[PDB]
């Protein structure tokens, strides 16, 4: 199959160097971006097979960023991206808050290249390495 | 003390993920994007200290980036990012062409990392490498 085009979002420099190295290494063509503001966006400027959103980040946070995602998808027309959380915080209630805000999966950190490969399967049917 | 933070610009997937590789080993904070269009929007959005910015991409080419990221830095009242050509395409015609369009310098494809490293150096004062 052909690469998966993959966005990933974090305000953390090392785990969204970590995530874009990663899927980079398993043959993903990755954008990588530090904010939800950023997030929403390059999701206006690109069709992505799937987005990775980390939840705590300042200003807008993942769910937020979803939010405004979901909201530009129904007001513009756009076929509806898969968004994974992937996030230091997946407790039961966090996870209901999550895909409540518009998100369809979760991982949590720290990632491996399983959970990346399988999820990116489950979602868009590409396989990684 | 925050590491360079550099864009790199390029139509071609494997071209991008080289010369984005390259910097990252260097130790700079990179940001890869495959258009022009890609290009002006990144630039408004994020503080770069320099652009790597490939020319044959189709609709906007990097002069026409170039032109566009001028015109706003000059409406929005930004200072000015410097910006590279790294292109396989510099006959002394291109090279000139490149220069009127508001671009600083060029390397020519394909690229090497002490290049790049000595173009850093040149256009933000910054160091890489083993002198970061
Ligand atoms: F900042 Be996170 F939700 F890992
Ligand atoms: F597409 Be280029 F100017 F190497
Ligand atoms: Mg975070
Ligand atoms: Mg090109």
């Keep these: ?21 990663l899927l980079s290494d398993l043959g993903a063509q990755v954008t990588a971006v530090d904010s939800g503001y950023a997030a929403l966006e390059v999701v206006q400027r690109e069709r992505f097979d799937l987005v990775f ?6 200003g807008m946070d993942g769910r937020q960023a979803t939010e ?23 407790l039961s209630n966090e996870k209901r808050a999550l895909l409540q805000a ?7 950190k720290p990632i491996d290249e399983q959970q990346l490969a399988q999820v990116v399967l489950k979602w868009t049917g590409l396989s990684l390495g």
């Design 1 to 21: 199959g052909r690469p998966p085009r993959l966005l990933c979002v974090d305000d953390n420099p090392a785990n969204l160097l970590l995530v874009q190295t």
């Design 53 to 58: 959103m980390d939840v705590q980040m300042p």
């Design 68 to 90: 405004a995602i979901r909201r530009w998808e129904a007001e513009r027309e756009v076929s509806p991206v898969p968004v994974i959380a992937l996030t230091a915080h997946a």
């Design 102 to 108: 518009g998100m369809d999966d979760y991982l949590t």
